[PDB]
Symmetry: C2
Subunit: 380 residues, 2 copies
């Protein structure tokens, strides 16, 4: 299933031969390839090797990016995680996660599951300079790709007016995955001109009222929230705005079916805890209640009306810019391997010579369930 | 674990290897009420649904079948009934009971096959027993519904106190076969058995009057309808937007540890009603405000509750009983069902009945809600 070459490295990393075989049998480790380079991808977690870890050889091991725990009550979440000790507060940028690393003679960009993104890898030199990897070839840039022309999202931060951008939020060591302290990472980002998430400053529990004011401002500005980090990067907690929760519901409600478990309920819970913590009442409360009802029902009702007349499927349209037409071809192939039903809907050349590719992703299982229900299917 | 007497009947009913798996896994269990032992089917086995109870070779009470719902009324009718006629009955919001003569006793069973000590002791208050003198092999299936219920905190608006029985089926022992609608209604009248309201005989061509009926039931805070072919072979339910919104209001006080999809299924049902009826503008906005309010207001109120104090999320509800012993039997029964319920208040009514106020607490929902309020971090 997977070569003993890769199993050999997993052993040198301390993994047990018996565990390696179980992972191989269950598909928890799989082989993949990008432009001729073979690598092992961890679909499941293995000891200190997180999901999304990729292995090319004994040195080129890129650990998966760790999950970040959330709090839904900000003040008490800070007291529990940080006590009264200081922490950095960074913008949580709404995009997709990437890890950028020098592998052999190539710069590869890995998405969260450990796939090489052909779009982001081809265009990485538009978003960052590569001087960093000349000096720090054993280091991994971790960041968010975010913007209005994204291959993976249909929303983004409001200050990105076109195309897509990189926002550094961590620098990690190969093989160990160890994060540099915040201050060192920011010094490297400035030294190399690497675009960074916005750092709002150093805060602590005693400054909770300013943090609430920050959340309210990010809400009005249609931004997602914050990530709180101890200076040594050992404690990390996220917290999202009510806008993030309401807009996610709006986007998701067009599809409604076949979404991750709890997608809607978790966000309703996050809204209720925000409303409780901030003691919002009266007319202000009613505005949130009306907004929640609207984003649950209006996009869903609109899709029911759509699927009730015709053979059209529920779809999302999105665009990206590419330098070479071949890249668009590589994306369609990549989208299929990821089991997504995506095709090219439109192509245009821009005034700067980039191709603007409009993709259409359809949701056939969600469409089928919605249409069967509309056509009167009876269920227990 | 389970007697060879009961396993023998299960075999005579068509179930031998499956019987042993059921015994080992606890899918069939033995129970007892006032000295009568019976087998209860905790899981379904072939044509024997969950809630089937077995006392002997003859006294077999089949579990009540699930009823499929439609969320799009006009197309659901076209699919289920085509253009053939069907009866339309009120769906009464209560709990399901099966009433049967077992030996010399009249026992009342809830959906899972437990004898309800409350409904069994008081059954003569809700129905007459003449029916079982003439039809001892028949089972009355009905809804117990009202403002003083042991199992619900809502009920139909036209029941002003206590609780009432509403007949909706008459089934044969052992076979579970339902009598045709017209025959069940004639029996209900002959024996004075209270019935669910029958709105009449409808068909697809009368879909606009059915919509008008739904709108009236919503305005009157009633749950919906059950549609039945005259031979009882095709049965479909459809609930009002009020039922969906009020269920959410009730559930949102607790939010956690509820059945999977409890909220999402009702939002789905709300959306299909709004689509089918082409509701728009201000009328649409009223439904969106109502949905937002019932999701958030009870939930926020409970967060405020658990944030100031050490109290647990609780529901208060009352019932009337004739004997205090009955209240004692209910507390014991509630514990056996793994519910944290205790007696909060007791009073004697002007008619000599005891009104018992129970308090059910929700320790698992309370703990999760409180941990979240106290800043617990989670993936
Ligand atoms: N400032 C930041 N620090 C860490 N992660 C971030 C930041 N901004 C955006 N992210 C992304 O946010 C994810 C954390 O969970 P969310 O709920 O997407 C990470 O995996 C990153 O992809
Ligand atoms: N008229 C009726 N016919 C059948 N079942 C009913 C009726 N009214 C209320 N019910 C109850 O409604 C249940 C059907 O699902 P409901 O609850 O979503 C049945 O199991 C009965 O307990
Ligand atoms: Mg994100
Ligand atoms: Mg979002
Ligand atoms: Mg019911
Ligand atoms: Mg109800």
């Amino acid at each position: 299933m997977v070569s003993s070459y890769f199993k050999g490295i997993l052993l040198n990393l301390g993994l047990d031969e018996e565990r390696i075989e179980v992972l191989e049998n269950k598909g928890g480790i799989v082989e993949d390839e990008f432009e001729g380079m073979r690598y092992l991808r961890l679909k499941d977690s293995a000891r200190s090797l997180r999901r999304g870890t990729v292995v090319f050889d004994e040195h080129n091991i890129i650990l998966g990016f760790p999950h970040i725990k959330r709090v839904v009550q900000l003040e008490n979440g800070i007291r529990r995680a940080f006590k009264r000790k200081p922490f950095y507060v960074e913008e949580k940028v709404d995009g997709y996660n990437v890890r950028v690393a020098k592998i052999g003679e190539k710069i590869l960009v890995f998405t969260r599951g450990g796939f090489v993104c052909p779009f982001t890898t081809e265009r990485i030199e538009d978003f960052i300079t590569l001087d960093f990897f000349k000096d720090y070839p054993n280091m991994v840039l971790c960041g968010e790709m975010a913007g209005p022309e994204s291959p993976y999202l249909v929303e983004g931060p409001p200050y990105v007016k076109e195309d897509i951008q990189f926002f550094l939020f961590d620098i990690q060591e190969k093989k160990t995955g160890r994060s540099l302290p915040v201050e060192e990472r920011l010094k490297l980002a400035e030294e190399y001109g690497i675009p960074s998430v916005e750092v709002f400053g150093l805060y602590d529990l005693s400054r909770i009222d300013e943090l609430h004011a920050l959340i309210d401002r990010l809400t009005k500005e249609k931004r997602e929230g914050i990530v709180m980090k101890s200076p040594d990067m050992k404690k990390i907690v996220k917290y999202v705005t009510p806008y993030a929760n309401i807009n996610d519901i709006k986007i998701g409600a067009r599809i409604f079916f076949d979404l991750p478990h709890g997608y809607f309920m978790q966000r309703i819970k996050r809204l209720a805890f925000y409303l409780a913590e901030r003691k919002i009442r009266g007319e202000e409360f009613d505005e949130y209640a009306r907004a929640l009802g609207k984003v649950l029902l209006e996009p869903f009702v609109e899709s029911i009306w759509d699927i009730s007349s015709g053979d059209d499927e529920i779809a999302e349209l999105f665009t990206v810019r590419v330098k070479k037409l071949e890249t668009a071809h590589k994306m369609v192939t990549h989208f299929e391997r990821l089991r997504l039903k995506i095709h090219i809907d439109d192509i245009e050349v821009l005034d700067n010579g980039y191709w603007r590719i409009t993709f259409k992703r359809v949701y056939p299982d969600a469409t089928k369930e919605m249409r069967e229900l509309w056509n009167g299917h009876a269920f227990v």
